[PDB]
């Protein structure tokens, strides 16, 4: 690591990452646009211990992440194009991912969940 | 791990706090000792964000806290021996303090419970 950097107020950190829970529900496309607009994304996680983390603090909430597709016939992406490692299943023939009480699901767009936003710690610099 | 961290691994940050959590009930004193070898203290909070990020990530299960008592006519105090600020009632007429369903509790010492630990960073 760079140093270490405590999260910004109502974030939490993991590993390298700073994670945002709301407590209000709405649709992937206002969550992805609210998350951007903390220079963040809806969340992704690149390892066990932070899917752990959203499982568990997630509760008995479904909460929308950064995963989704063009159609049910297009590969899974993060919301910055990066293409989904195919390391878990996600259920159903929908285009957005959400985590729910088993793991990642899909759901249509105008489903409304609460969301997560994530972002690498910037050490407080960026 | 490249980049920063607020914490290391298997501990998590919130405001100027790392927590630990323990998946592993044991009792009051085992769990101090845990918290003292780790350079951290059976867990403490100084925030309204602190304590209800314990209260959260616990989930169903209790958990040890950082606050005790010599009897239950002493004042409670963290482990490093600071008074408590009696901001928020404890139940019971038990020495040990833990986290449950309902807010902050109080047991024998030789209760198994799982714990957190704190530390500042
Ligand atoms: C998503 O929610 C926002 C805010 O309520 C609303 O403006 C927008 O129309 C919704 N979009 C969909 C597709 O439901
Ligand atoms: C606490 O737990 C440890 C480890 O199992 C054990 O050595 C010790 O006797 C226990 N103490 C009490 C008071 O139960």
Request: charged share 20%; glycine share 6%.
């Amino acid at each position: 690591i760079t140093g270490y950097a405590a999260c910004p107020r109502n974030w939490i950190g993991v590993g390298n990452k700073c994670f945002y829970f709301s407590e209000y529900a709405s649709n992937w496309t206002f969550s992805q646009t609210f998350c951007k607009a903390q220079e963040a994304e809806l969340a992704r996680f690149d390892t066990e211990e932070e899917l752990n983390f959203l499982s568990r603090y997630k509760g008995s909430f479904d909460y929308w992440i950064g995963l989704h597709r063009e159609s049910s016939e297009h590969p899974w992406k993060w919301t910055d194009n990066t293409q989904y490692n195919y390391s878990l299943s996600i259920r159903g023939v929908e285009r957005y991912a959400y985590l729910n009480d088993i793991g990642i699901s899909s759901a249509r767009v105008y489903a409304d969940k609460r969301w997560s936003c994530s972002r690498l710690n910037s050490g407080t610099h960026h």
